[PDB]
Design a protein around this ligand. Structure first.
Ligand SMILES: Nc1nc2c(ncn2[C@@H]2O[C@H](COP(=O)(O)OP(=O)(O)OP(=O)(O)O)[C@@H](O)[C@H]2O)c(=O)[nH]1
Ligand SMILES: Nc1ncnc2c1ncn2[C@@H]1O[C@H](COP(=O)(O)OP(=O)(O)CP(=O)(O)O)[C@@H](O)[C@H]1O
Ligand SMILES: Nc1nc2c(ncn2[C@@H]2O[C@H](COP(=O)(O)OP(=O)(O)O)[C@@H](O)[C@H]2O)c(=O)[nH]1
Ligand SMILES: COc1cc(OC)c(/C=C2/C(=O)Nc3ccccc32)c(OC)c1
Ligand SMILES: [Ca+2]
Ligand SMILES: [Ca+2]
Ligand SMILES: [Ca+2]
Ligand SMILES: [Mg+2]
Ligand SMILES: [Mg+2]
Ligand SMILES: [Mg+2]
Lengths: 352, 54, 439, 430
């Protein structure tokens, strides 16, 4: 009888994982404060990694990677991408991004932000930007001082990123979307991409000359279920799965999903994770980590994939919950704790 | 990465390597603390011996 | 030359002292009977080994040591042991009844009746010192003697020798070998009352030493003898610069200056490599790069924590063996490009290196193999706060029900000293997290 | 922290105590003449804890034998090891106490107690460092119950800072001399709650069931019961009597076992369970010792450990075995049944090992549990009490000796309080 505890009641994914675990017949749930557990399904904030791995005769495993927030906070992600050599300033798949603290504090990149901004004013180029924090407080504008206004209007650090102004739009609809990929990193730092991703769609024709109405500009399931009139017309949940998107690419663009998008997604995923690997690896540690991540992508009209953010505590789409969670137990939990594939392993060693 | 203040001797050597520059109570208060706890002890013991006398 | 006095308090302190002093003798070529052929200054002198040994007219080299137990079994086995003749009777001080794993019994009840005798026997050694530096104090956090009497001792050492430096070698409580359920209580009480009296403390978590003995010495269930011979190896690399010619950490003030820029945050993590089984028939000897790299694996630390999720304020590398500066810098250059080593913004990123050419000495018939080169890294990282978090949690768990409290209160302690101590610890955890983590 | 002073009071106290000295005299290689013929000085290194050294280098048990009647103590002087005992330490009146707590505590016993305390004082005055006292008695009769607790009170008066330890046998209608036993026991439990540091609750109920259900003895005697009792006593005193890692004494046991001063009623457990004379020869493996010693069928107090929670657990393993395997199994019970150990006392199960096994076995394990399920025992005693006290039945035997119904009501109340505190911690959660 392996033993586990549950310190995130709000978690869709690991609620399901806990249910499947109990139904193994060989896993017992203990009380939240019992130290004598094999597996911690832990909280999101202030998870006490300092206390794990000090129970003699207990191999301990946790469902989060200490240090992973560097990837899953937008400010940290911008800092990590511009500071880590393996990612670079010279990085083809991240939007040009600057971190801007509010007025109150008065290191911040504001004066370096407007320097590139003005050469986009100088160059006749598209210079619409996004500002966001880590449908809340999103503002898209081509006037810098508009946002620099807005960002200090709110007292938290934000990032100004380039807005991808010619995105790929599904017809019928002439409408936006983002792609959500689910990645599982196990205790060995195997990187497992889940075969099923989802396209969070917009149901509203994209419109280039009115940036403030944001139901045609933000593909978030919440905003979609609220202010959008056409919620559910083309897709059931404003969600299109991979069979259909692949077929539509085949029919309308003559490519496939793997060639046009999924190669780039796999390259971005394994670069971002192989980067932070030495800072988070629990290879020789006294406790062990896996973690489920949600990577979020945008495809522009050229079939180029841009990473926009990494999500550290992601919810799954309702159709996939079973499969993915079974997978999480199979390769994240059962590998460490044996009883009595739906993933692609991301691995590559080009010689040079 | 600079190697500075290097000293050598028959038994060894020492040096510094820099990779990047930088971005009480009294004797009598104590005897009072101890004696306060000793009298707390003696009070508790006398309460015990009182209850046993009853 | 400036003498240091070693004080060993309680079981853990005394037995670890045995381990160290045995090791020191072997290193300086001092035999069990006190004679040192190598010393041509019969009668005395001011060589650097004299920081730890004084001399008699017959050529005896006597440790500048005091052993203090509230009960006789352990110090009796010193009084009758292999180094029977090494020490002066007057330096082995024994009670009759011990502290029963009770901080308050060792501090208040039994401490009061023996503090003066110990201080007089200590001053008899200080009166033999032309320039005394201060004290190295060996004890456990969990014992009743080791926690309570040590802290009373530390207060009075501050008042009787206020200008001298005080260093702790402290054994942090591990349930695998732990004797007592109340060791978290004792640990907190004594950390609180000793914090401002200690200039630099080296924590040894018995759990780390135990697993090092299992994993790297192939020892199925380590004894205190295995634990203590490994601990004394570490202690000897930490003290070798006070006992040997050199120019790094040559006096106790330099330990604080090099490792402790914030007086409260004075707990430097010690990593040590290589620990090699003496029964291992074939061993490829490790390189300067390999052992310097081993200094950044948690499995080699005296306390297991994760320095990657903290920041550094100082780092010293002490090498004993065949090492030259060139290879150290090559190794550091390599390591810095593969590892998370973030200092605090207001401290230089860098290493202070000391090298003694004599390789580590291992006790004949011990568990450790001889090696051609070894290193002990002393790093003041905020990650060690993890250990405090552990202890405090256990304390919080018991104290919420006031479990066992009555044993303390019945020795004359007051429930309030518990929460005072716990709030000092809360302060300490907060200091660490501010220094080492960002918003 | 060396010498212990042993007192055995009344019929049961003296029969179980005599067995104790037989067993441990055999373990320490000391013969009925008090001479020593053993082969390991592991047998003599802490022999002073329980024996004084006398001329001829003979060893005399630091034992005081008390009764209000001469019957059983005569039979002790007659029995196998009787002549090992120092004769002055036989202190007995001729009254008898009639299974009556009042005669033991207030009338008959008061006449004899000062003589007992004289022999106690003379045994302690010789002690290099006395750690305290251990008493053997039952709580169902009158001498051991009534006088035994009188003695404990007077000893706490004279030696308030020494550990008081008892082996106290609780009564059961399954093994029952008289109907007034629940009265005597309630009256003593009160005393024990205020006046001892550590009490081993040896339930005569549990001893009968072990004998009957597990050892297959159809008609158990007090001899079959006392075999189990003397095995448990050997086991719980091993740490005191032999050299070890732990260097064990009564005070550290108290400090680590008793988180709350009134909750010091320990549930003992032995493995393997053994009939007298039965030579059984199969090696017991360490997983077997652990599972059995924690089995409720191996407990000497008739409580269900799964109806409560362990506040603390102390264990001793005896014999040549793998301390790695021992640590493995002890961890395995804690980790596999973590529900049954309080989470607000971290690492509350402590374990010791001794090379020397007891006579007859190659391997054995003794268990001391401070469990909240012990309340079940006191509840049982309470019901049997109220059943009678509701009608003031048999009360005259006590009021005739000076006692008031109020005293009974006080004692009933304090026991029901004890039960409530145990339940408090059985529901407390960190
Ligand atoms: N490393 C090491 N730890 C020890 C040694 N002896 C005891 N300990 C640890 O110290 C704690 C108990 O402290 P002790 O030194 O035995 O207690 P003490 O100072 O003698 O105090 P009292 O005996 O209670 O009067 C436990 O965590 C033991 O594991 C030892 O020789 N080496
Ligand atoms: N540089 C950019 N260019 C174009 N569109 C962008 C963009 N950045 C974000 N978006 C769009 O805005 C939406 C919300 O942005 P954001 O990445 O901040 O999601 P979020 O953090 O609020 C919730 P989740 O964790 O589920 O993604 C994205 O899905 C995308 O449609
Ligand atoms: N286990 C055990 N119980 C006993 C023994 N003798 C008496 N009892 C129990 O002790 C109680 C009577 O106490 P007893 O010692 O005979 O009376 P006392 O001499 O006046 O203290 C009853 O509950 C008996 O069942 C014995 O040798 N072994
Ligand atoms: C199980 O039988 C026993 C087991 C014991 O330690 C395991 C002890 C002595 C103990 C001791 O000396 N310190 C302790 C701390 C916790 C638990 C028990 C002790 C003991 O003393 C009578 C009896
Ligand atoms: Ca000399
Ligand atoms: Ca000072
Ligand atoms: Ca009379
Ligand atoms: Mg001790
Ligand atoms: Mg009878
Ligand atoms: Mg008299």
């Amino acid at each position: 009888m392996y033993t586990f505890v549950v310190r995130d009641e709000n978690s869709s994914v690991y609620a399901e994982v806990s249910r499947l675990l109990l139904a193994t017949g060989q896993w017992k749930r203990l009380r939240k404060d019992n130290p004598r557990f094999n597996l911690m399904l832990g909280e999101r904030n202030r998870l006490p990694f300092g206390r794990l791995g000090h129970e003699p005769g207990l191999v301990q495993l946790v469902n989060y990677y200490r240090g992973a927030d560097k990837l899953c906070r937008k400010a940290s992600l911008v800092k990590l991408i511009k500071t880590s050599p393996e990612l670079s300033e010279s990085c083809t798949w991240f939007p040009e991004s600057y971190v801007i603290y509010p007025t109150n504090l008065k290191t911040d990149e504001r004066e370096v932000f407007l320097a590139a901004y003005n050469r986009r004013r100088e160059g006749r180029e598209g210079n619409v930007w996004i500002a966001k924090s880590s449908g809340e407080g999103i503002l898209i504008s081509s006037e810098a001082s508009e946002l620099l206004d807005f960002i200090d209007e709110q007292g938290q650090v934000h990032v100004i990123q380039k807005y991808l102004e010619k995105p790929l739009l599904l017809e019928p609809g002439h409408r936006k979307f983002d792609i959500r990929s689910w990645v599982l990193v196990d205790h060995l730092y195997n990187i497992y991409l889940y075969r099923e991703g989802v396209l969070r769609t917009s149901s509203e024709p994209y419109n280039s000359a009115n940036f403030q109405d944001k139901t045609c500009h933000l593909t978030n399931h919440c905003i979609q279920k609220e202010y959008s009139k056409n919620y559910g017309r083309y897709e059931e949940g404003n969600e299109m799965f991979f069979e259909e998107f692949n077929q539509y690419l085949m029919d309308a663009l003559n490519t496939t999903l793997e060639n046009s998008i999924l190669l780039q997604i796999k390259h971005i995923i394994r670069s971002c994770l192989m980067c932070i690997e030495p800072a988070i690896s629990t290879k020789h540690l006294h406790y062990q980590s896996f973690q489920l991540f949600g990577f979020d992508f945008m495809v522009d009209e050229e079939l180029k994939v841009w990473l926009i953010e990494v999500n550290g505590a992601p919810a799954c789409a309702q159709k996939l919950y079973a499969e993915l969670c079974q997978g999480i137990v199979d390769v994240a939990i059962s590998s460490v704790f044996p009883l009595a594939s739906i993933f692609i392993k991301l691995h590559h060693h080009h010689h040079h | 990465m600079e190697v500075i203040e290097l000293n050598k001797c028959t038994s060894g050597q020492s040096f510094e390597v820099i990779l990047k520059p930088p971005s009480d109570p009294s004797l009598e208060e104590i005897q009072k603390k101890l004696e306060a706890a000793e009298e707390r002890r003696k009070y508790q013991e006398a309460e015990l011996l009182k209850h046993l006398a009853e | 030359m400036r003498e240091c006095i070693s004080i060993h308090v309680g079981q853990a302190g005394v037995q670890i002292g045995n381990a160290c002093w045995e090791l020191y003798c072997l290193e300086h070529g001092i035999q069990p009977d006190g004679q040192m052929p190598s010393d041509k200054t019969i009668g005395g002198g001011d060589d650097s080994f004299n920081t730890f040994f004084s001399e008699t007219g017959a050529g005896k080299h006597v440790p500048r040591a005091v052993f203090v137990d509230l009960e006789p079994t352990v110090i009796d086995e010193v009084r009758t042991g292999t180094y029977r003749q090494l020490f002066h009777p007057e330096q082995l001080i024994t009670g009759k009844e011990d502290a029963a794993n009770n901080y308050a019994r060792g501090h208040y009840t039994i401490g009061k009746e023996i503090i003066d005798l110990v201080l007089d026997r200590i001053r008899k050694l200080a009166d033999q010192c032309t320039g005394l530096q201060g004290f190295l104090v060996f004890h456990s956090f969990g014992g009743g003697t080791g926690s309570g009497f040590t802290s009373l001792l530390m207060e009075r050492l501050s008042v009787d020798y206020g200008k001298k430096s005080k260093l702790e070698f402290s054994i942090y409580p591990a349930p695998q070998v732990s004797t007592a359920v109340v060791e978290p209580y004792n640990s907190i009480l004594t950390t609180h009352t000793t914090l401002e009296h200690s200039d630099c403390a080296f924590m040894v978590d018995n759990e780390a030493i135990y697993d090092i003995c299992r994993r790297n010495l192939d020892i199925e269930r380590p004894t205190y003898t295995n634990l203590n011979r490994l601990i004394s190896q570490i202690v000897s690399s930490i003290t070798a610069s006070l006992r040997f010619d050199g120019a790094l950490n040559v006096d106790l003030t330099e330990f604080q200056t090099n490792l402790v820029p914030y007086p409260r945050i004075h707990f430097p993590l010690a990593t040590y490599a290589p620990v090699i089984s003496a029964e291992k028939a074939y061993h490829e000897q490790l390189s300067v790069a390999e052992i310097t790299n081993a200094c950044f694996e948690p499995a080699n630390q005296m306390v297991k924590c994760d320095p990657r999720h903290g920041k550094y304020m100082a780092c010293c590398l002490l090498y004993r063996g065949d090492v030259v500066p060139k290879d150290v810098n090559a190794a550091i250059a390599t390591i810095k490009t593969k590892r998370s080593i973030q200092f605090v913004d207001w401290c230089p990123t860098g290493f202070k290196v000391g090298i003694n050419y004599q390789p580590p000495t291992v006790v004949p018939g011990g568990d450790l193999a001889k090696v051609q080169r070894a290193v002990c890294m002393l790093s003041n990282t905020t990650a060690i706060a993890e250990a405090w978090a552990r202890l405090d949690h256990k304390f919080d768990l018991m104290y919420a029900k006031r479990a066992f409290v009555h044993w303390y209160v019945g020795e004359g302690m007051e429930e309030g000293e518990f929460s005072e101590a716990r709030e000092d610890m809360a302060a300490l955890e907060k200091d660490y997290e501010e220094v080492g983590v960002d918003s | 922290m060396r010498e212990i002073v042993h007192i055995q009071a009344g019929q049961c106290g003296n029969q179980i105590g005599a067995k104790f000295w037989e067993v441990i005299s055999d373990e320490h290689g000391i013969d009925p003449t008090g001479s020593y013929h053993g082969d390991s000085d592991l047998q003599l290194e802490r022999i002073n804890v329980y024996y004084n050294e006398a001329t001829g280098n003979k060893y005399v048990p630091r034992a005081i034998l008390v009764d209000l009647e001469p019957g059983t103590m005569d039979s002790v002087r007659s029995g196998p090891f009787g002549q090992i005992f120092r004769p002055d330490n036989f202190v007995f009146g001729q009254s008898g106490a009639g299974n009556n707590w009042a005669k033991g505590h207030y009338t008959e016993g008061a006449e004899l107690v000062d003589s007992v305390l004289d022999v106690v004082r003379k045994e302690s005055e010789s002690c290099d460092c006395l750690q305290g006292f251990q008493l053997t008695h039952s709580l169902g009769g009158g001498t051991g119950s009534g006088m035994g607790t009188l003695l404990i009170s007077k000893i706490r008066e004279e030696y308030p800072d020494r550990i008081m330890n008892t082996f106290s046998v609780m009564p059961s209608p399954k093994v029952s001399d008289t109907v007034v036993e629940p009265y005597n026991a309630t009256l003593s439990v009160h005393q024990l709650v205020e006046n001892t540091d550590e009490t081993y609750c040896i339930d005569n109920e549990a001893l009968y069931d072990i004998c009957f259900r597990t050892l297959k003895l159809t008609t158990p005697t007090y001899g079959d019961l006392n075999h189990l009792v003397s095995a448990t006593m050997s086991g719980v005193t091993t740490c005191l009597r032999f050299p070890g890692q732990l260097n064990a004494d009564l005070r550290k046991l108290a400090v680590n076992m008793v988180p709350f001063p009134r909750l010091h009623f320990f549930m003992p457990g032995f493995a393997p369970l053994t009939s007298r004379g039965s030579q059984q020869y199969r090696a017991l493996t360490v997983p077997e010792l652990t599972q059995q010693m924690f089995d409720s069928k191996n407990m000497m107090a008739a409580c269900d450990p799964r109806h409560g929670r362990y506040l603390t657990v102390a264990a001793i393993f005896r014999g040549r075995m793998s301390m790695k395997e021992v640590d493995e199994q002890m961890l395995n019970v804690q980790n596999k049944n973590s529900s049954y150990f309080v989470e607000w006392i971290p690492n509350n199960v402590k374990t010791a090992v001794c090379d020397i096994p007891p006579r007859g076995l190659k391997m054995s394990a003794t268990f001391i549990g401070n469990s909240t399920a012990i309340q079940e025992l006191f509840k049982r005693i309470s019901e049997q009490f109220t059943a009678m006290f509701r009608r003031k039945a048999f009360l005259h035997w006590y009021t005739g000796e000076g006692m008031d119904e109020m005293e009974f009501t006080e004692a009933e109340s304090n026991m029901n309080d004890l039960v409530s505190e145990y339940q408090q911690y059985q529901d407390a959660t960190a």
